[PDB]
Amino acid sequence: SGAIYVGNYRVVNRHLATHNDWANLVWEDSSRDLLVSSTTAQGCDTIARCDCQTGVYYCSSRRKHYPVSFSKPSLIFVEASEYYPARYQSHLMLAVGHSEPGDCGGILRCQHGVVGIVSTGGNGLVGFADVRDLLWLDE
Ligand SMILES: NC(=O)[C@H]1CCC(=O)N(Cc2ccccc2-c2cccnc2)C1
Ligand SMILES: [Zn+2]
């Protein structure tokens, strides 16, 4: 689990969104595994606006942060799970590292801020849904 809080927005994995996230929906993209809902409290996370390919992510299944190199956001084939059939997920970044389904929502950060959240894994890889292109999150 996990979310990003910036201004009056809450960014979560679309497959983990609650009834309240859907009742206050701002934007959702199944191909990205992202959903953004509105909040009454002001969030103060900082989103990165950069093209970094190195950062640190939180891994709940190890209670640890790990430094990783990751690929730029791209269209990657993701095996079926109970939430989606097998499909291509867009704006996804991969790194070599540990990830389990319950790790989804863990933040990846670079020196400029939040880069994205854990969204895929298995086979010794960890996949992050990018948020750096969502410039409206800051306005
Ligand atoms: N964005 C998505 O389509 C996700 C929906 C929910 C979901 O469980 N996954 C698979 C997954 C996520 C995180 C860590 C590991 C795995 C996983 C484990 C075992 C073998 N393959 C994948 C994909
Ligand atoms: Zn950066």
Side-chain angles (χ1 to χ4, degrees):
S1 52
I4 302 168
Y5 295 95
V6 46
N8 291 299
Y9 295 123
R10 165 170 138 104
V11 189
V12 290
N13 295 89
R14 190 191 183 274
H15 73 276
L16 300 182
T18 72
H19 300 306
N20 280 315
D21 284 319
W22 275 101
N24 296 277
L25 178 63
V26 170
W27 170 80
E28 54 80 24
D29 190 327
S30 188
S31 81
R32 302 176 63 152
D33 186 43
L34 287 186
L35 183 150
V36 176
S37 54
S38 63
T39 69
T40 49
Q42 191 76 23
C44 6
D45 288 328
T46 290
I47 309 299
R49 306 294 188 194
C50 66
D51 72 342
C52 287
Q53 278 185 267
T54 69
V56 176
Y57 79 102
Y58 179 63
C59 179
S60 59
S61 62
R62 296 285 180 262
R63 291 175 187 133
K64 282 193 182 49
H65 293 264
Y66 289 104
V68 282
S69 283
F70 50 90
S71 62
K72 298 180 168 185
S74 76
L75 221 217
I76 292 162
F77 190 72
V78 172
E79 299 296 319
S81 63
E82 73 177 36
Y83 293 104
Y84 300 107
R87 83 214 203 276
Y88 284 88
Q89 181 163 319
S90 65
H91 296 270
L92 184 58
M93 297 172 294
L94 294 183
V96 177
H98 184 69
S99 190
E100 288 177 50
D103 290 319
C104 289
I107 284 168
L108 166 69
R109 298 185 68 96
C110 66
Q111 64 178 124
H112 309 98
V114 179
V115 172
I117 48 169
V118 173
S119 173
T120 71
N123 277 356
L125 298 171
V126 53
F128 310 95
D130 183 50
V131 299
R132 295 179 288 189
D133 67 312
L134 302 180
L135 317 181
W136 53 264
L137 287 175
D138 271 319
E139 63 205 29

mmCIF file of all heavy atoms in Angstrom, residues 50 52 110 112, ligand 2:
data_model
loop_
_atom_site.group_PDB
_atom_site.id
_atom_site.type_symbol
_atom_site.label_atom_id
_atom_site.label_comp_id
_atom_site.label_asym_id
_atom_site.label_seq_id
_atom_site.Cartn_x
_atom_site.Cartn_y
_atom_site.Cartn_z
ATOM 1 N N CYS A 50 12.062 15.959 -13.971
ATOM 2 C CA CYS A 50 13.427 15.614 -14.409
ATOM 3 C C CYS A 50 13.404 14.366 -15.287
ATOM 4 O O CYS A 50 12.356 13.724 -15.407
ATOM 5 C CB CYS A 50 14.285 15.337 -13.163
ATOM 6 S SG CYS A 50 13.758 13.855 -12.254
ATOM 7 N N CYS A 52 15.844 11.846 -14.400
ATOM 8 C CA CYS A 52 16.724 10.923 -13.618
ATOM 9 C C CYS A 52 16.460 9.468 -13.956
ATOM 10 O O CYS A 52 15.296 9.081 -14.161
ATOM 11 C CB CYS A 52 16.537 11.115 -12.105
ATOM 12 S SG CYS A 52 17.263 12.633 -11.422
ATOM 13 N N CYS A 110 14.041 10.576 -6.306
ATOM 14 C CA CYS A 110 15.388 10.969 -6.738
ATOM 15 C C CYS A 110 15.740 12.279 -5.983
ATOM 16 O O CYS A 110 14.929 12.784 -5.205
ATOM 17 C CB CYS A 110 15.383 11.185 -8.249
ATOM 18 S SG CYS A 110 14.355 12.581 -8.773
ATOM 19 N N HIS A 112 15.368 15.187 -6.875
ATOM 20 C CA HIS A 112 14.373 16.235 -7.207
ATOM 21 C C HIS A 112 12.968 16.003 -6.616
ATOM 22 O O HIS A 112 12.103 16.897 -6.680
ATOM 23 C CB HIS A 112 14.260 16.411 -8.742
ATOM 24 C CG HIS A 112 15.563 16.604 -9.451
ATOM 25 N ND1 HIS A 112 16.202 15.551 -10.083
ATOM 26 C CD2 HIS A 112 16.291 17.730 -9.636
ATOM 27 C CE1 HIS A 112 17.290 16.064 -10.635
ATOM 28 N NE2 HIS A 112 17.396 17.370 -10.382
HETATM 29 ZN ZN ZN B 2 15.393 13.662 -10.558
#
